[PDB]
Design a protein around this ligand. Structure first.
Ligand code: SF4
Ligand code: SF4
Ligand code: SF4
Ligand code: SF4
Lengths: 73, 92, 73, 92
């Protein structure tokens, strides 16, 4: 592995490309013969909203480190 | 104005001397492109098509990668920012 | 109408038997030729539980004189 | 014991000199009846079949009317209590 660091050259017997989506480093290894087309990916926009620990209990119907997940269609 | 209110909430270490979003050919964005999907699908309003060219406000880039993929002609030299640079998501 | 009261005899041109289930007074008027059999009725047992106005908001997912109804099967 | 804890929560004006639940024939409850559905379906545990006869604790009657209807032989002289007597449901 070569890095953006100045003296950065890490030697290894194997390299695990666990770098997620945007397969920039996968294309350098010969895998991913093309880039991602805009039908293999989904733009996911997320907000983390500060809701003060008791309205979370009220609007989800839970209490005390028990959680609920909503899936919105 | 609107989304830079929400980009102010994020934490950045901006690398201003190294723009990680370069456009390979500005002429493709003027006559070859019709709808400019880099502008209309950027979650951080990085791209803005003026008549002076394309204004790439790379400092607010959320490093998602949509612009590189949604661009039909491939003329976005898209990199991640360097290590310890770009978005720094706290409670991501 | 005659009542259980001592001098109780109310005179009226019409009598509306709106006395609910247990058709005791309906059978006196000639209607309801038999009593209720135990398939025309359902035993409904109800508790009113004192839950202090904010756990009601939390367990129903509501707030401020907005209510929710659960039907339990 | 168990349900008279919950019958204590209700409000009553008991009419002890006028029992509104009379059993027309005690002998039907001894040999003619097999399962005694007045006991097993009374929400207030009014009826209890002892060997001394049927104990009708009419003071806890919730005036529902189940006993009169669930009795297969019709030998429950069932009335409502008089006016201003019986259960007095607060927030019913
Ligand atoms: S998409 Fe490619 S071409 Fe269309 S504007 Fe953005 S960069 Fe120029
Ligand atoms: S990466 Fe995501 S945010 Fe940065 S420019 Fe491309 S699209 Fe806009
Ligand atoms: S149901 Fe009728 S018969 Fe059977 S016990 Fe109660 S009263 Fe006696
Ligand atoms: S009326 Fe309801 S409560 Fe009173 S005895 Fe008959 S069943 Fe039990």
């Amino acid at each position: 592995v070569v890095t953006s660091r100045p003296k950065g050259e890490i030697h290894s017997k194997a390299v695990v490309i666990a770098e997620g989506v945007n397969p920039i480093l996968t294309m350098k290894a010969g895998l991913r013969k093309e880039d991602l087309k805009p039908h293999m990916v989904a733009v996911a926009v997320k907000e983390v909203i500060s809701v003060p620990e008791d309205v979370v209990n009220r609007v989800f119907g839970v209490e005390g480190n028990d959680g609920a997940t909503i899936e919105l269609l | 104005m609107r989304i830079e209110d929400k980009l102010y909430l994020n934490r950045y270490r901006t690398d201003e001397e190294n723009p990680h979003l370069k456009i390979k050919d500005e002429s493709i964005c003027a006559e070859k492109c019709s709808d400019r999907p880099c502008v209309s699908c950027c979650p951080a309003d990085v791209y803005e098509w003026t008549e002076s060219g394309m204004e790439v406000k790379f400092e607010g880039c959320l490093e998602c990668g949509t612009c590189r993929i949604v661009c039909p002609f491939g003329n976005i030299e898209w990199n991640y920012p360097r290590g310890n640079y770009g978005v720094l998501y706290k409670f991501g």
